[PDB]
Amino acid sequence: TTEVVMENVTAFWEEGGTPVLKDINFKIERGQLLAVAGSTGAGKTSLLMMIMGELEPSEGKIKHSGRISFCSQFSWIMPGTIKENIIFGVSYDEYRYRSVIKACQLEEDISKFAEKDNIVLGEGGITLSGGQRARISLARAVYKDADLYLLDSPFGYLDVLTEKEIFESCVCKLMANKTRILVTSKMEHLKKADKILILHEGSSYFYGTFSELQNLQP
Ligand SMILES: Cc1cn([C@H]2C[C@H](O)[C@@H](COP(=O)(O)OP(=O)(O)OP(=O)(O)O)O2)c(=O)[nH]c1=O
Ligand SMILES: [Mg+2]
């Protein structure tokens, strides 16, 4: 019933360096949303890396099981069509694909190309905007079938309202039944999350709910 657990986790990127994560604690039940916030260098991406097994803890316990889909904070494209970039070697299903591109507002973009979903990216032709590349990268991660979705600041280059709309249509509605960790700073995302973890220089600045944090004000 619990999907991801960290208990008293401390970790280092360099032996004898300073810890990148210090005494971190959280729990996510199946289907819940954890928001992970904090300033640059706080350890948010490192926390995701530990879940993906690229960073081993020096102290503490970690629990998680199953396939992971990871959306990097650095959007990327490979040579191929926009459809191929989103499916990215996963089996194709029209309904699933269309649901994702609609939730990511990409249907609007794609409808304007004569080649539609067969427009070729990453081969010197179309030069995508930063917001387009971010929404394609998010769609790629969301299309993949996984037990756990790790979305590392996926709303790069998007204006406030577009970010809000895609957070609601993709992360909250399309992915409503999925276990999600979303690295984000935005107030509405923290308010909608089941739990919030705010990191500061590796430490747990706050862990709880948005309501609990409100109760602390005053
Ligand atoms: C991800 C990563 C971080 N680090 C170091 C860099 C930092 O000193 C520290 C924490 O880095 P990050 O985990 O990358 O911090 P962040 O993701 O919260 O920052 P941002 O909002 O800008 O994305 O770990 C490594 O040494 N190797 C790595 O692969
Ligand atoms: Mg990061």
- Phi and psi torsions of 61, nearest 5°: -125, 145
166 touches 135 (CB < 8 A): yes
Cβ of 47 closer than 6 Å to ligand 1, yes or no, is no
**Residue 44 Cβ < 6 Å to ligand 1:** yes
Sign of the alpha-carbon torsion through 27, 210, 181, 72: negative
CA of 40 to the centre of ligand 2 (A): 7
The 10 Å Cβ neighbour count of residue 25 is 13
Mutate-to-test residue for ligand 1 from 9, 20, 22, highest number of ligand atoms within 8 A of CB: 20
Q: Which ligand is nearest the CA of 40, by number?
A: 1
Distance CA(121)–CA(133), nearest Å, equals 10
Topology, domain 1-218: Rossmann fold (3.40.50)
Atom of ligand 1 nearest to the CA of 45: 17
- Written as six digits, the tokens of 93 are 């299903």
Verify whether ligand 1 is closer than 6 Å to residue 41 (CB atom).
Answer: yes
Yes or no: say if 167 and 175 are a contact pair by the CB < 8 Å rule. Answer: no
Amino acid, single-letter form, for residue 4 = V
Output the CA–CA distances (angstroms, integers) from residue 170 to 42, 74, 76, 100, 131, in the order listed.
26, 19, 19, 7, 15
Q: Where do the structural domains in the chain lie, given as residue ranges?
A: 1-218
DSSP string across 39-95: STTSSHHHHHHHHTTSS-EEEEEEEE-S-EEEE-SS----SEEHHHHHHTTSPP-HH
Rg (CA), the chain: 18
User: Measured between alpha carbons, how far is residue 90 from residues 84, 86, 139, 140, 143 in Å?
Assistant: 9, 9, 13, 10, 8
Enter the tokens of residue 24.
């971190």
Closest CA to 34 of 155, 164, 148: 148
Tell me the residue type at 100.
V
Name 5's bridge partners: 27, 63
